[PDB]
Amino acid sequence: MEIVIRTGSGDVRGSKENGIAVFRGIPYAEPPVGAHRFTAPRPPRPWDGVRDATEFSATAPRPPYPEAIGALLIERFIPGDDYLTLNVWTPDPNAVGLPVMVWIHGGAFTNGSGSEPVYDGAAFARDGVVFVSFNYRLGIIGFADLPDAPSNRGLLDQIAALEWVRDNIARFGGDPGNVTVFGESAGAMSVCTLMATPRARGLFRRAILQSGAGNMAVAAEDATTIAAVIAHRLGVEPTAAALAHVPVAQLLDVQQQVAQEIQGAPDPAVWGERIAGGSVLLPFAPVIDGELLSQRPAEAIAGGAGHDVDLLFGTTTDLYRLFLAPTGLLPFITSDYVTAHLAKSGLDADAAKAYTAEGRGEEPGDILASIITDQVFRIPALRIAESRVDAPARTFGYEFAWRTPQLDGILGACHAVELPFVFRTLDRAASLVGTNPPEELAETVHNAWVRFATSGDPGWPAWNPETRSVMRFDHPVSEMVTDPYPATRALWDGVPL
Numbered sequence: 499m500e501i502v503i504r505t506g507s508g509d510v511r512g513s514k515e516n517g518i519a520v521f522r523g524i525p526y527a528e529p530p531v532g533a534h535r536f537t538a539p540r541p542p543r544p545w546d547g548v549r550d551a552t553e554f555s556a557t558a559p560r561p562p563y564p565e566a567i568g569a570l571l572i573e574r575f576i577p578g579d580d581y582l583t584l585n586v587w588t589p590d591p592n593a594v595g596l597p598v599m600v601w602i603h604g605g606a607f608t609n610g611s612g613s614e615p616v617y618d619g620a621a622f623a624r625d626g627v628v629f630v631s632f633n634y635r636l637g638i639i640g641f642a643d644l645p646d647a648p649s650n651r652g653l654l655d656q657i658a659a660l661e662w663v664r665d666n667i668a669r670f671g672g673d674p675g676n677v678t679v680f681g682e683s684a685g686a687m688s689v690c691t692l693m694a695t696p697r698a699r700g701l702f703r704r705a706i707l708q709s710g711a712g713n714m715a716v717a718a719e720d721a722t723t724i725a726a727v728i729a730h731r732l733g734v735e736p737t738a739a740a741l742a743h744v745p746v747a748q749l750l751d752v753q754q755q756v757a758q759e760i761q762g763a764p765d766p767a768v769w770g771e772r773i774a775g776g777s778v779l780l781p782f783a784p785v786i787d788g789e790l791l792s793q794r795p796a797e798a799i800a801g802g803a804g805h806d807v808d809l810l811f812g813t814t815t816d817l818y819r820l821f822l823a824p825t826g827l828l829p830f831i832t833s834d835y836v837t838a839h840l841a842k843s844g845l846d847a848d849a850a851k852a853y854t855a856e857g858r859g860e861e862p863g864d865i866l867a868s869i870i871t872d873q874v875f876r877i878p879a880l881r882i883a884e885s886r887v888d889a890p891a892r893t894f895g896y897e898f899a900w901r902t903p904q905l906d907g908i909l910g911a912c913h914a915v916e917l918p919f920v921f922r923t924l925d926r927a928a929s930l931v932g933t934n935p936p937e938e939l940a941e942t943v944h945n946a947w948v949r950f951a952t953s954g955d956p957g958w959p960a961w962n963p964e965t966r967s968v969m970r971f972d973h974p975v976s977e978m979v980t981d982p983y984p985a986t987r988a989l990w991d992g993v994p995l
């Protein structure tokens with residue numbers, strides 16, 4: 499059972515059970531406590547002897563998901579301060595040059611962890627892939643911009659963990675030259691951010707963007723506003739020097755309140771006109787700080803960032819229904835609301851018709867959901883694929899179309915449902931995908947992910963702007979499709995950002 503591997507910071511003890519060596523809670527950065535909430539991740543103190551790497555470590559401080567989301571997306575909080583840790587699954591640490599997959603969890607930069615059961619790496623290890631997951635700093639601590647703190651610590655954490663992988667994964671049987679980094683949404687947007695970040699150079703050879711693209715950044719001045727509001731509500735200065743002492747429950751509380759206010763209609767008196775106008779999608783997304791992130795990841799990618807990196811990208815067909823549907827309130831959304839929403843992107847009311855004509859929404863709420871799926875995920879994802887037309891690296895796309903049965907099927911192929919199929923952790927995600935999700939689909943998606951990590955090819959035709967081909971994952975039939983939803987797609991050609 500017990501298996502001991504040398505890391506850069508000293509020896510770790512995992513456990514091999516059934517030809518899988520599992521290491522949990524390998525620290526890649528010192529506990530980011532107090533002032534170190536907001537410092538660059540520090541190499542862990544290089545211990546002598548054997549540190550236990552058998553239990554998942556603490557996870558980053560996060561608020562609960564909203565009641566709606568949270569019933570579907572059941573997080574596993576692990577208390578503690580020492581959460582800048584990573585987990586490795588390998589079939590054999592003595593293996594030569596196994597594909598390494600580094601998982602960057604999503605959760606809108608405020609939630610999630612590497613260690614959520616659904617992100618279990620065993621299924622990747624069983625297929626000859628070294629799997630790495632890890633926690634990175636979230637929310638205020640991870641990403642709120644402060645004048646006296648390096649920006650985007652959660653991003654610096656991701657780099658640190660990817661650098662850990664670079665420096666250590668060979669001792670867990672992995673090829674540091676064959677690292678596929680992958681993430682869901684905020685994790686995928688992170689990947690996009692990393693492609694745009696000098697400090698991530700060469701840290702991954704391939705990327706799987708699962709329902710996340712290069713549009714999730716906060717302008718510096720909006721991050722400054724967010725930090726200021728956070729601070730005013732904490733009765734302290736908008737500085738790391740101040741926030742280093744706020745009890746995390748009060749950080750999270752104010753953080754949570756910022757998240758909801760930005761998710762809703764932000765008061766312009768509180769937030770300024772930009773943020774009230776919607777300049778901020780996610781308020782704790784990486785800040786365009788100028789150094790780590792000189793520009794929005796989409797523009798960097800449009801200019802060739804990550805073009806040397808093989809890309810498997812995709813979205814869930816009904817992604818945003820996760821956020822609009824599970825409270826039973828989709829039917830109350832109105833056409834004029836969709837029209838006003840369309841108008842924010844300079845689209846006329848009748849753009850909604852294209853959604854209806856393409857099976858993407860009978861009622862306004864259905865359309866809004868699809869519109870938002872397009873605006874924040876599918877079109878940004880496609881803009882990345884389009885930017886890579888001349889990239890030396892390969893681009894493959896997918897659409898996760900399997901509709902979850904939960905809540906009478908109201909969710910469709912909503913956000914996150916592809917996670918347990920990717921990880922073959924379907925029995926850990928029944929709150930989201932129900933009790934009897936098709937395991938064949940899990941095998942299919944997972945093997946494609948394994949194939950992509952292994953060779954840069956998921957096993958289906960490459961995505962190009964000619965045919966815009968993607969693997970439409972569903973059950974019983976996952977089959978290639980071409981240029982899915984072209985009319986709604988063509989709606990966004992001139993839409994800013």
Ligand SMILES: O=C(OCCO)c1ccc(C(=O)OCCO)cc1
Pocket residue numbers: 603604605606607610682683684685761779780874914
């Ligand atoms: O809709 C989103 O942002 C637009 C704001 O209006 C959104 C972004 C990221 C995530 C995420 O990281 O989900 C992964 C959960 O495992 C979820 C939702």
